[PDB]
Amino acid sequence: SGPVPSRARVYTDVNTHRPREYWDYESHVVEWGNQDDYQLVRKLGRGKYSEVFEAINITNNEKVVVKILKPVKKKKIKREIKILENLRGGPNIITLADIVKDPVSRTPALVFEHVNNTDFKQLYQTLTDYDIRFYMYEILKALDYCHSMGIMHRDVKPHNVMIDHEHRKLRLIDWGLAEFYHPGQEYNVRVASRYFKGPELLVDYQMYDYSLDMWSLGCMLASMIFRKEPFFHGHDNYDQLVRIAKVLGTEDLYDYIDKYNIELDPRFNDILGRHSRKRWERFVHSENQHLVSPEALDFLDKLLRYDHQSRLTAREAMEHPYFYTVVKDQA
Numbered sequence: 330s331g332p333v334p335s336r337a338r339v340y341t342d343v344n345t346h347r348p349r350e351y352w353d354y355e356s357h358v359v360e361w362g363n364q365d366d367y368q369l370v371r372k373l374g375r376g377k378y379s380e381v382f383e384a385i386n387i388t389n390n391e392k393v394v395v396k397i398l399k400p401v402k403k404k405k406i407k408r409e410i411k412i413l414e415n416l417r418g419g420p421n422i423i424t425l426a427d428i429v430k431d432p433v434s435r436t437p438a439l440v441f442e443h444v445n446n447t448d449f450k451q452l453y454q455t456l457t458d459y460d461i462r463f464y465m466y467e468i469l470k471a472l473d474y475c476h477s478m479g480i481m482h483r484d485v486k487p488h489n490v491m492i493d494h495e496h497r498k499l500r501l502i503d504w505g506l507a508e509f510y511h512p513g514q515e516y517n518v519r520v521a522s523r524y525f526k527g528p529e530l531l532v533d534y535q536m537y538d539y540s541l542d543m544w545s546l547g548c549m550l551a552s553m554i555f556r557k558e559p560f561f562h563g564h565d566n567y568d569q570l571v572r573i574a575k576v577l578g579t580e581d582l583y584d585y586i587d588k589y590n591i592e593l594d595p596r597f598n599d600i601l602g603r604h605s606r607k608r609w610e611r612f613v614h615s616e617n618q619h620l621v622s623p624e625a626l627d628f629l630d631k632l633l634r635y636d637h638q639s640r641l642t643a644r645e646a647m648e649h650p651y652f653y654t655v656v657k658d659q660a
């Protein structure tokens with residue numbers, strides 16, 4: 330009794346009809362810039378795949394950010410590079426400015442445009458109801474754009490969202506886990522970060538799509554309007570699903586595994602229990618009430634759904650009443 334196949338409800342065959350070279354990053358040949366044009370200034374953060382620093386382009390005193398990669402596999406490198414080039418110039422998509430050979434690390438260092446970011450842990454405590462709606466809209470532009478270009482980000486979370494608040498500027502970063510979508514393809518579920526992992530990842534259903542990003546976006550929103558970051562705090566990948574079940578309820582969770590004929594890892598048997606689906610109003614309090622509205626809850630509710638197929642797409646979400654105001658571009 331294998332799982333039931335699944336397809337994205339949108340942008341299903343965008344790569345199908347594009348030139349092989351578009352999505353075939355393995356054959357992509359990296360062209361390098363001059364590492365001598367950049368000087369590191371400060372470390373911004375470090376991960377299992379790289380260390381990031383603020384830097385300066387010795388050529389024009391322009392500020393930049395350098396991502397020095399850890400050894401990982403040539404294939405992995407080309408993938409991130411191809412996706413960044415394919416998406417460059419897209420709305421709110423971080424701009425890859427250069428690619429160079431770090432002589433010290435002997436690995437490739439990716440050079441991006443710099444954003445005067447404000448640590449999200451501090452910024453979120455300041456955000457107003459309008460800010461949230463605004464930045465959420467900006468993130469949707471990015472997601473709709475990359476999805477429409479046949480690409481799944483796969484690591485949507487506050488950390489990969491740079492915000493220059495005074496300029497109301499937002500860029501989506503870290504496309505290291507991003508991958509092209511091909512209908513019927515069974516992906517690796519080891520993506521995204523624990524707290525933003527969708528139930529598909531948690532239950533091990535590999536035939537997922539762009540909708541994975543929409544669940545991740547839902548988690549950010551909930552954490553934003555409720556002033557609780559992260560919203561779903563699991564102790565591990567298993568307990569993570571438990572935290573979600575304790576909110577969305579176990580009935581709908583089980584209805585989901587039945588629909589796609591998913592075989593749950595026995596390890597869940599002793600931890601999921603039985604839980605009623607709570608009302609989004611249960612997370613409202615004197616400290617976040619000002620950020621919660623009927624439209625915000627209706628919208629959140631349509632993003633945070635077990636069935637990835639029933640989740641709102643980025644283009645559909647942008648049409649929600651929650652965003653009517655967001656001082657529509659126009660001028």
Ligand SMILES: CC(C)Nc1ccc2cnn(-c3cncc(-n4ccc(CC(=O)O)c4)n3)c2c1
Pocket residue numbers: 373374375381394396423441442443444445446488489491502503504505
């Ligand atoms: C290491 C990061 C996520 N943390 C961090 C912490 C403090 C700061 C402060 N600024 N800043 C920052 C500013 N502009 C661009 C990028 N950027 C562009 C591409 C990537 C990296 C990528 O694309 O993976 C990062 N990062 C930070 C970034």
